[PDB]
Design a protein around this nucleic acid. Structure first.
Lengths: 218, 62, 112, 211
RNA sequence: AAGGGCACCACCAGGAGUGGAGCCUGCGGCGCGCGCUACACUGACGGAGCCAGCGGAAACUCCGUCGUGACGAGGAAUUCCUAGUAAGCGCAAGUGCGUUGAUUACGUCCCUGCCCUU
């Protein structure tokens, strides 16, 4: 089961980009991720970043995606895209840390070193890469933005319409609120998935489920 | 596709535009009757092929 | 180049130089997109492109194709250039330049 | 969307019961959990995050928003909790724990205004709280895989569906055997508890034309 | 306010980078700049061919052998740039020289600046 990366420009696959992700280190003399639990005090004092500190959402989404069959089947890769404009590629075989405390440690280290390397292997597990995301994407790739205010779709149907050699890239806002335009400049359209507002993770399961159904994944 | 080829007559001498893009008056080359104002991207002097798909578009300062 | 031409001719008779010309012929874009103002969250506007640029960019595409096309592999530029020139001198979605042109263009019909 | 409770024994709903949930308070009180109490200790009996994970995964679902879902939690020490479909569970584990600790001490979480109980410890067994027409199933890697959409469509127009999922990192699928009709798998790959939850929610959303 | 102009410390279209590693070296302080060496098959090794200028050179060519077996090609930032030039290459002299040799620009006032006149 060949591991999918940006280097491969041909394979048909599903890509999720967790746009607008809240990852930021915090000094204190030790480092941690800026996050609404520890730093709601500080954030308010400064009078900003009100919910600009939700790295947990990213964490949730990641577990949700990598834990998914479509990932296990090797038909999915993920990318991150930080509020501050940092882009990350996520090796699909990475067993991301289960808890947020351990997640934080590792994201703090990834951000400072720009990559996370397997202790025995020379392929990275996470890698900071250069914008724009559209260089690293497959050549024939449909690009959409998930949005509550966009026309609702059935993902299974939305997917069966894709050319047999055409990938699908979905941008999810990994955040608590905000305009869904974090990607207007790249996408072909925006779609809704439910008549109910969803959380990023749920949008993500919903979409994986759908691809899993349509691409025959159990 | 009903592709239609055109020939430049007059690149404009005084304009107003964003840099890079220039407006061109084209003769239509299937008939000599139709003439359009269009927008080109690359550096263009007179008397050449233009590939057209959308046939009117009547564009303006961009 | 010499080698490529030979490889192309072995893979279709033809003038490989006819093959070259074609790849350049059916590669150039029709409507390229400019970065209009937008009002902040910029929106691209559907410009037509010059024949000199069409040629210029084509050549660009096919060589960056071959060069970067067949990187870490078991092939020679002569070969991967024959591959990129043959695939493009016919059009069959097997070519990194054809795929790219069709996407630049799909994008243009969007900005109309 | 009128709220589903154990009293309503007629309506056709989907019920997920998070079994072997790790909710053991630790006197210092806070929730016992790997991160902090790694050192103090077997880590498997202390994975409340999994529960917290699933609660978000479950309550955030379109099916709960359509109010045809019901969550129950049954810990590894046999404590039983009914979750109110309309509760907006805390998003962060920390806040989750504060709340979860309180609920275990007080036996219920009350809304600061409404008479409703956002969370409640109820008495066993879970069978005395489910609908009278209700299929009992256990999720298991070690069982025949199924399409959730197909399965749901075979249900009587009145028959509810209650799945037992293990909110644990590892272990035997026996936790509900005294209650289950049948054990089944949702995948060829082994899933995390929360993922297994999505699968079912989503398959049943599909089956039930949600939405 | 108006009309002209000029400019990659502007824009329109690229190249080469710098900002990543260790080390060398200067500067600060008690982080910054110039560099050197690096992470193969458009290669390496062996024959062989064999060509400069300033004061039988190397890259390179051909014929063979080998056969994919800290740093894994550099974050946010950001510099300079229009032909024998850029880059590559080595050579003499204490900065010069030649060899191989390009892609892109030669456009505009949309933007940021300045200048002119009103």
């Amino acid at each position: 089961p060949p591991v999918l990366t940006s280097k491969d420009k041909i394979t048909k696959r599903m890509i999720v980009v967790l746009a607008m992700a809240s990852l930021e280190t915090h000094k204190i003399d030790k480092y941690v991720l800026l996050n609404c639990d520890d730093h709601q005090g500080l954030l308010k004092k400064m009078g900003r970043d009100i919910s600009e500190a939700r790295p947990d959402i990213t964490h949730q989404c990641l577990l949700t995606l990598l834990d998914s069959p479509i990932n296990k089947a090797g038909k999915l890769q993920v990318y991150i895209q930080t509020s501050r404009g940092i882009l990350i590629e996520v090796n699909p075989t990475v067993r991301i840390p289960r808890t947020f405390k351990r997640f934080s440690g590792l994201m703090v280290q990834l951000l400072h070193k720009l990559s996370i390397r397997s202790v025995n292997s020379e392929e990275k597990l996470l890698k900071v890469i250069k914008n724009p995301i559209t260089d690293h994407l497959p050549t024939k790739c449909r690009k959409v933005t998930l949005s509550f205010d966009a026309p609702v779709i059935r993902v299974q149907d939305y997917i069966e319409k894709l050319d047999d050699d055409e990938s699908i890239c979905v941008f999810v806002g990994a955040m608590a609120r905000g305009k869904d335009n974090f990607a207007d400049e790249y996408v072909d359209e925006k779609v809704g998935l439910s008549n109910y507002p969803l959380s990023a993770s749920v949008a993500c399961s919903k979409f994986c489920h759908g691809a899993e159904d349509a691409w025959n994944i159990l | 596709t009903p592709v239609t080829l055109a020939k430049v007559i007059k690149v404009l001498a005084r304009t107003g535009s964003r840099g890079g893009v220039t407006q061109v008056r084209v003769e239509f080359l299937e008939d000599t009757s139709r003439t359009i104002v269009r927008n080109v991207k690359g550096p263009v002097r007179e008397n050449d092929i233009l590939v057209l798909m959308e046939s009117e578009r009547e564009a303006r300062r961009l | 180049i010499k080698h490529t031409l030979d490889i192309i001719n072995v893979l279709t008779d033809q003038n490989p130089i006819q093959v070259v010309v074609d790849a350049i012929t059916n590669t150039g874009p029709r409507e390229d997109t400019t970065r209009v103002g937008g009002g902040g969250a910029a929106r691209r506007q559907a410009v037509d492109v010059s024949p000199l640029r069409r040629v210029n960019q084509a050549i660009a595409l096919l060589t960056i194709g071959a060069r970067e096309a067949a990187f870490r592999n078991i092939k020679t530029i002569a070969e991967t250039l024959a591959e990129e020139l043959i695939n493009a001198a016919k059009g069959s979605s097997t070519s990194y330049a054809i795929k790219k042109k069709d996407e630049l263009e799909r994008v243009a019909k969007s900005n109309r």
